[PDB]
Ligand binder design. Structure first.
Ligand SMILES: Nc1nc2c(ncn2[C@@H]2O[C@H](COP(=O)(O)OP(=O)(O)OP(=O)(O)O)[C@@H](O)[C@H]2O)c(=O)[nH]1
Ligand SMILES: Nc1nc2c(ncn2[C@@H]2O[C@H](COP(=O)(O)OP(=O)(O)OP(=O)(O)O)[C@@H](O)[C@H]2O)c(=O)[nH]1
Ligand SMILES: Nc1nc2c(ncn2[C@@H]2O[C@H](COP(=O)(O)OP(=O)(O)O)[C@@H](O)[C@H]2O)c(=O)[nH]1
Ligand SMILES: Nc1nc2c(ncn2[C@@H]2O[C@H](COP(=O)(O)OP(=O)(O)O)[C@@H](O)[C@H]2O)c(=O)[nH]1
Ligand SMILES: [Mg+2]
Ligand SMILES: [Mg+2]
Ligand SMILES: [Zn+2]
Ligand SMILES: [Zn+2]
Lengths: 439, 54, 100, 429, 439, 429
């Protein structure tokens, strides 16, 4: 019951899933190999692990997740890693050739011939699950298989799984730094599926995650490992309400319906606090009010967008630890007074609260300090239109000369697809602006 | 490792001896951890029983 | 006058207007305003005053010019990012969007 | 995921010999063929360049080609020369005569059937062919002519497969050939039509980088080929080894080729320092980027400051921080806007490989689609036009039946290449 | 409750704050590690440190301070000094390049790249205080950072905190002792902030402190360390009323109202007595009348301005120790009796008195000596117009032929700024003389 | 707060070599770059002049310039010559010929390409470059020509960055060149626009100081360079070490330059005493100030008694408080009011550093913008006009691309600077 099938697409999704699983196994008491101690008949006395792992015909735990990559390096690393025995030999779908940062290659040529096998594995996972809450997709819109193949997988999941919730956590191109030239094309094309075939999409841009680690975690040279550890902390904070006892239980459908006012308006900006290093932690009294203020501050933001430049529409605050209604309500009351943050006139409530009694866990070698309490915001706000404006302006610059369109044509898509993607992103900005308008 | 631990201890010793002998700042000279040689009166102070929050 | 004010000295002494923060930073905004959401690329060292003045408009903001002699004044437009060198064509912008 | 390589001609064979030296050293393969590595990662993806034999030997997937057999004793006389299959050695009695006509129509044609048979053998034994690689020099007869013929036939059965060509563009100053412009012009159009991407290595630039940066007194042809071998080893690092941000030949082609005919790049390697200056260098990205983007580091003798970078690719290898490897590129893009084309934002693609080259803690290979590539084509184009105006050395090409029109056709195609580079350089938003 | 935030600006500010915070730690029994091991005299969980130290989950007492300097010399040496554990790694922030005694550079170019983080840290500090009394800003206007960045910080704090108390401990260029040559320019240009955004501006010039220490403490060689210790003693005497119990408790606004007669007549001289040496101390019976007379004498005063050239407007006395109110009453009576010091006609009372029980704490190894009682006077008087009429004369001499103005105008400051500052200062002498004039 | 240094000509190269000797001795650095200091305060701000290799070796951030490779060989073979980067030495085939035209337009202009390449490499490698440093002589060809060309092309790239130059002003009493006034005039007008502040060195005054104060029987260029090196290290004492009253190069410029053209200072060092009088001299700061304002202790040959001090700066080092650095400044201001300027109150700025130079328990460096600094500009002016009127030694300059108009403009600019100095000297409040 309360299962949530995790999906990882591309290198970004696969590594984020690896860092998520090193946290989930440690938090629910599953060994990296997955088997139980020899003397113990049952590895874990409780079944709080049920949502992420399914026990097998030997007693040990296989995760309720799928890895999916068109290139074999990352999945073979997972096969040869310390979790070689935890993961199913299947549910780890590998291709013999990547998508080459090409949405057309990931969606129309290489993606279509592997997506049905991926859906077969997903169907076996769903058959195993008896109380499936939804799907927990992790990928990056800037990649080839992460964007195109993730889009195709989301479309097939939507057509085959009904209205089941499909939460997504996607790494977007950063306002400053990028690792690809065709990344704007991939993001623009992936926004098609992410705009119609997903319930709530989470911005996870590496620039803001790097800034978070640099200013707070005090890592002078952070990396993808630290970034994925922070992402896994955010995901665990979101999901722990159905795994641990809490004051205000919050589910996937709960915070996907309390978050989005319109079907098109479902792209949310998320932040996590208190993200502090060990040196930081024993110097500050990390109270509920302090962590709430840090969350609402753009310093603690995981997306390189300033919420003060827009209007908040729906914030879902997931608190973990020794937090209390004595203090969370006070923090909310005193943060609504603050006038940097500001809500649309048609959503006065604008706040969802989910309190969980379990504090965050600590991963060995991680830079996250042990905090008595934490809070993660999932915020739908009109300030998210900034990143869309930047990305499709880069798309317009790259598309005026029809640059790199020959790769997509050679991998099997129409130029009308580029045109429709640009038009739909322009419409997305238009109705973001409209819903930000007053009555 | 053992060599790394010895190097770390050597750096800690160097950090401690940074200000011993004709290499010392005015801050180092006039700002020491001499908290045990101060006799301070602590029988006058606000008890601070009444506080508020929001 | 006889006592120069904050408006005389170039710094705002009033709370800024926040509707200028409510307004989205849309590609429509850039098409109508003149400029691009692309961040300005400045020939500057990282983490320097020159880079900050080239990339942010709150760094070079100055309220008025000189003494005032030589329904109050409100600000709130200097918070954001400097605009790019490119110009947003109108054809890349949608006049209407599907919503309720 | 695995590629098959071919060396064409004297220059191509000698470059490929030391390229395979580097590959075998990096994968822990003996000069004889047995595996003598100390890590699992060496054997993890050894099938990319090697095939396992009956007795556990590791034979390179390499096809050796030359019309001159007098220089294919040296390729097997090299320290790793006994690594290749005896049946992958293809020879002809007489040399190409430094004649593109002989190497492409008369002598090469009688020799191309066996070469394609060997290539098809390698492809069929290959499980999922990632691409064909070629190493040759455009200034020769059986390197330019036979190499272009080989890639032309390769496209006939492997259209979508990645065609790497490490073409050695001869330079006027280090020139040792008079039919140099003729062969280069006759091969450039075939390279344009039948190569997914083609990086240009110039002997003058190789000599200069060995002379100033390395400062070593005697860089011979072997020392020149050492840098080319290092670049070849670094361009396929992510196919063979895991990395934080891996890639492959197709992915670099997608992120570097904006238009189908614009697939000529500049190669650079870092770090390269002299013996004396070895104590004095800091080993970090804040030094690798300087060497990589430095003017003198390019292996092509046309300074990248002529035009603007269409696209750039940085294959970093070793222990790096991903944000420190990407924010350096962000800084260069931020602060060098004049040398990067405006209508294509974020021109630099950075990829990370965990395992560096053997003997090096950290390194990087550079692939730049700068519009300065037109400079070499020009400086050989004026030479070709001067040669052609007076009908110099055309009987040596028309005695094989090749007609005087194809010179004008090659000139037209080459001028179109230069013109499209110039137009895209001068394009405005 | 009763919390107060200390902001130190520039090298002079940091140097003063070091002594201030060591003296506060000695007051409250807090080690540089930041703990309270065991004290029999201290009651169970007694908190008289709440004004300057905030409790932390680690049991630490983190100072409510913010150190600023545009270059990292003093900041780094404090970060590597004795109080590494006491001071947060943040709240002690630095730039990278100094202002170079350029008000324009520190107010428009280099100050603005750090003032945002300064406000962020100040807001973080103020969120933890539920009874914030006000801000004390320690700086010297004769420098670059302390003038420019200090003025910018005060201007931003005015709008960020409204009518909260501002107490600017400012070190003006003394009439003879003065380091920089553009120092008159910096002092004159920084006059607007001290006139408008500082509620009370206390004078701590160096030459008067040097004369005081050479004539009364009988040490041939005091230093910046000694003058900063004296300044910290003065600040502790001012804040003792709100820190510890006393017969007459006075707060920041409590003496603000009594000390500021007109909206900007708030530049006040400082004096302290008995300043005494180890050999001097144990041979005299320091009576309250004697120490008050020594305070009112113009040789035990911390500001080089002779009161006999002006009219006393309002004097606030802060007594510490075993002082009975009758002693201070007799002191006031004899002060009103004696003629060589004259009060302004329209202020008959002109006197505020605050008695605090806990005596000053001696700092062995420094320069002071243990005394059973002490008193610090903060006096608003018309005699303070002399230092203004000297600094503006120096400004006119320097600015007559546009000397050293290219440095200021090349940092993005208009030429008219000098004229505006000169006119504002001139109006300052004008209305000082006007209020000093008899009715 | 980085300072990236450069040396021009053989004079500048020797002075910079001695300067790095002094800096390495202060920071505890062997000729091999290893660190053996007695405290970590050296490594705390060792970056300001040295860069650390990944191997721990500390290499000076200095660029050496000379058209004669013999100077590079001598510096490299010097006692501390193995410290510098081997590629940081830049050399030409033929020397400047003691010609400003050759060093600035024909031969020096060619080699400044590589000079700027290495200089920009070093300058960018800085985390936050506080300024550039230059050591040269205006009486030579390479130092006067190439040094001014470098400062001109560095001002264009780093506008607001501070620009130190230590130019050895030659004097007829120690004359050893006849194109001396030509080179001096051609370099002064460049340094006026291209240097934010610049203090001058005269071998006459260095020799006089060595003879009368140090009482050296045979003073040498090594001794003069040691004096200049000690004071050039002391000018950055607050930058490299913590102090009570910190200062930087920009601070020195702000407090010493009243007007943009007036930035030519006269400088000195203290304490200085003979070998036989070291134990008799009572080193008190009053004595330090007395020697600091002593006319004979100035290392630029012009008596301050004929002019007035626009500004002065005293960088004191050692265990010492603020009254010995301000109250005696008040004393000298009051008792030499005729020697100072009325319209600039507090002519003398004082800076305090907590780390004195080793071998001393306290010291001071003096930098004075006296109005008498224009006496040398006078004398060099009529010296220049003496040959300019008769067109003597002008064909060497005119044969290298330069014209008489440049000479006329240079003389006019120098005369304008002289007139500004004189008018600000005799100006009244
Ligand atoms: N947060 C995070 N982002 C990553 C990570 N790895 C890759 N990315 C993002 O992904 C982008 C690179 O493209 P990929 O996502 O790796 O592409 P892919 O999904 O593997 O698909 P292909 O390009 O066809 O191989 C980078 O710009 C990153 O923003 C990671 O480990 N953590
Ligand atoms: N009382 C006191 N004043 C100091 C101290 N240190 C510096 N000052 C004052 O600072 C003035 C010189 O200003 P600066 O050297 O520019 O120092 P600053 O004001 O912090 O500004 P910058 O250091 O340039 O950023 C002197 O006139 C002193 O009055 C100190 O330790 N105690
Ligand atoms: N870098 C490099 N260049 C080479 C090498 N061998 C030959 N060349 C160049 O190739 C040209 C001769 O081409 P050649 O090899 O004879 O062509 P082929 O007859 O088709 O094999 C000469 O101008 C050389 O500069 C080599 O080992 N390394
Ligand atoms: N202080 C000092 N001055 C020197 C030294 N060597 C040369 N000079 C001065 O430099 C002047 C000549 O400079 P020159 O050698 O022509 O410079 P170049 O042409 O650039 O190499 C002479 O007047 C000397 O006084 C030295 O080692 N120390
Ligand atoms: Mg991938
Ligand atoms: Mg300072
Ligand atoms: Zn006004
Ligand atoms: Zn734009």
């Amino acid at each position: 019951m309360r299962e949530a099938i995790c999906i990882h697409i591309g290198q970004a999704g696969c590594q984020v899933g690896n860092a998520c699983w090193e946290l989930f196994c440690l938090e629910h008491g599953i060994q990296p190999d997955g088997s139980m101690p020899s003397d113990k008949c049952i590895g874990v006395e409780d079944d709080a692990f049920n949502t992420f792992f399914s026990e097998t015909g030997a007693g040990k735990h296989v995760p309720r997740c799928l890895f999916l990559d068109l290139e074999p390096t990352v999945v073979d690393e997972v096969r040869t890693g310390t979790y070689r025995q935890l993961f199913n030999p299947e549910q780890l779908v590998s291709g013999k050739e990547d998508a080459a940062n090409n949405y057309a290659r990931g969606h129309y040529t290489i993606g279509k011939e592997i997506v049905d096998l991926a859906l077969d594995r997903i169907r076996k996972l769903a058959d195993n699950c008896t109380g499936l809450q939804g799907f927990m997709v992790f990928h990056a819109v800037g990649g080839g298989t992460g964007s195109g193949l993730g889009a195709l997988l989301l479309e097939r999941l939507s057509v085959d799984y009904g209205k089941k919730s499909k939460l997504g956590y996607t790494v977007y191109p950063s306002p400053q730094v990028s690792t690809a030239v065709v990344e704007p094309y991939n993001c623009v094309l992936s926004t098609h599926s992410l705009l119609e075939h997903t319930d709530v999409a989470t911005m996870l841009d590496n620039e803001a995650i790097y800034d978070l680690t640099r200013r707070s975690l005090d890592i002078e040279r952070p990396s993808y490992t630290n970034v994925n550890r922070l992402i896994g902390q955010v995901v665990s904070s979101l999901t722990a309400s159905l795994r641990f006892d809490g004051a205000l239980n919050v589910d996937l459908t709960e915070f996907q319906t309390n978050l989005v006012p319109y079907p098109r308006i479902h792209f949310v900006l998320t932040s996590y606090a208190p993200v502090v290093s060990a040196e930081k932690a024993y110097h500050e009294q990390l109270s509920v009010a302090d962590i709430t203020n840090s969350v609402f501050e753009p310093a603690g933001m995981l997306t390189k967008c300033d919420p003060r430049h827009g209007k908040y529409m729906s914030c879902c605050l997931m608190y973990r630890g020794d937090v209390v209604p004595k203090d969370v309500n006070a923090a909310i009351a005193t943060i609504k007074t603050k006038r940097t943050i500001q809500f649309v006139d048609w959503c006065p409530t604008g706040f969802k609260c989910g309190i969980n009694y379990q504090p965050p866990t600590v991963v060995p070698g991680g830079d996250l300090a042990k905090v008595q309490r934490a809070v993660c915001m999932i915020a739908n706000s009109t300030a998210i239109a900034e990143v869309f404006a930047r990305i499709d302006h880069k798309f317009d610059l790259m598309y005026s000369k029809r640059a790199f369109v020959h790769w997509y044509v050679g991998e099997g898509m129409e130029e009308g697809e580029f045109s429709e993607a640009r038009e739909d992103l322009a419409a997305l900005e238009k109705d973001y602006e409209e819903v930000g308008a007053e009555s | 490792s053992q060599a790394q631990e010895m190097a770390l201890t050597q750096r800690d010793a160097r950090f401690q001896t940074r200000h011993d002998g004709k290499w010392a700042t005015t801050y180092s000279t006039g700002y020491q951890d001499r908290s045990a040689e101060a006799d301070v009166c602590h029988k006058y102070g606000a008890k601070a029983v009444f506080d508020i929050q929001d | 006058h006889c006592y120069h004010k904050c408006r005389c000295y170039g710094h705002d002494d009033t709370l800024p207007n926040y509707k200028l923060l409510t307004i989205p930073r849309t590609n429509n905004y850039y098409a109508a305003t003149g400029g691009c959401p692309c961040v300005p690329r400045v020939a500057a060292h990282p983490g320097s005053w020159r880079l900050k003045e080239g990339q942010l408009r709150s760094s070079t903001y100055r309220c008025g010019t000189g003494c005032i002699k030589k329904c109050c004044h409100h600000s709130g437009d200097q918070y954001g990012w400097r605009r790019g060198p490119h110009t947003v064509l109108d054809k890349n912008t949608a006049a209407t969007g599907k919503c309720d | 995921r695995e590629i098959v390589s071919c060396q064409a001609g004297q220059c191509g064979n000698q470059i490929g010999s030391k390229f395979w030296e580097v590959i075998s050293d990096e994968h822990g393969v003996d000069p004889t063929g047995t595996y003598q590595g100390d890590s699992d990662l060496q054997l993890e993806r050894i099938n990319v360049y090697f095939d396992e034999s009956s007795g556990g030997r590791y034979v390179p997937r390499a096809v050796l080609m030359d019309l001159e057999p007098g220089t294919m004793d040296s390729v097997r006389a090299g320290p790793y020369g006994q690594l290749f299959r005896p049946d992958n050695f293809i020879f002809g009695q007489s040399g190409a005569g430094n004649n593109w006509a002989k190497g492409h129509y008369t002598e090469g044609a009688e020799l191309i059937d066996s070469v394609l048979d060997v290539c098809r053998k390698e492809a069929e034994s290959c499980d999922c062919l990632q691409g064909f690689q070629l190493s040759h020099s455009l200034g020769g007869g059986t390197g330019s002519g036979m190499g272009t013929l080989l890639i032309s036939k390769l496209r006939e059965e492997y259209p979508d497969r990645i065609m790497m060509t490490f073409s050695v563009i001869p330079s006027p100053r280090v020139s040792d050939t008079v039919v140099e412009p003729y062969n280069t012009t006759l091969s450039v159009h075939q390279l344009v039509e039948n190569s997914d991407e083609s990086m240009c290595i110039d002997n003058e630039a190789l000599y200069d980088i060995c002379f100033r940066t390395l400062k070593l007194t005697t860089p011979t042809f072997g020392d020149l080929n050492h840098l080319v071998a290092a670049v070849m080893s670094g361009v396929t690092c992510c196919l063979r080894f895991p990395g934080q941000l891996n890639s492959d030949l197709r992915k670099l082609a997608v992120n570097l080729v904006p238009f189908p005919r614009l697939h000529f790049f500049m190669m650079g390697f870092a770090p390269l320092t002299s013996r004396g200056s070895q104590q004095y260098r800091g080993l970090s990205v804040a030094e690798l980027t300087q060497q990589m983007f430095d003017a003198k580091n390019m292996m092509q003798a046309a300074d990248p400051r002529h035009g603007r970078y269409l696209t750039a690719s940085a294959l970093f290898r070793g222990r790096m921080s991903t944000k420190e490897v990407d924010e350096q590129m962000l800084n260069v893009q931020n602060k060098n806007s004049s040398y990067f084309i405006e209508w294509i934002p974020n021109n630099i693609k950075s990829s990370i490989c965990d395992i560096p080259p053997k003997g090096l803690k950290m390194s990087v290979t550079f692939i730049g689609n700068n519009t300065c590539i037109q400079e070499m084509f020009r400086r050989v184009g004026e030479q070709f036009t001067g040669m052609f105006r007076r009908k110099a050395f055309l009987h040596w090409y028309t005695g094989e039946g090749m007609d005087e029109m194809e010179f004008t056709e090659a000139e037209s195609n080459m001028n179109d290449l230069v013109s499209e580079y110039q137009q895209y350089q001068d394009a405005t938003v």
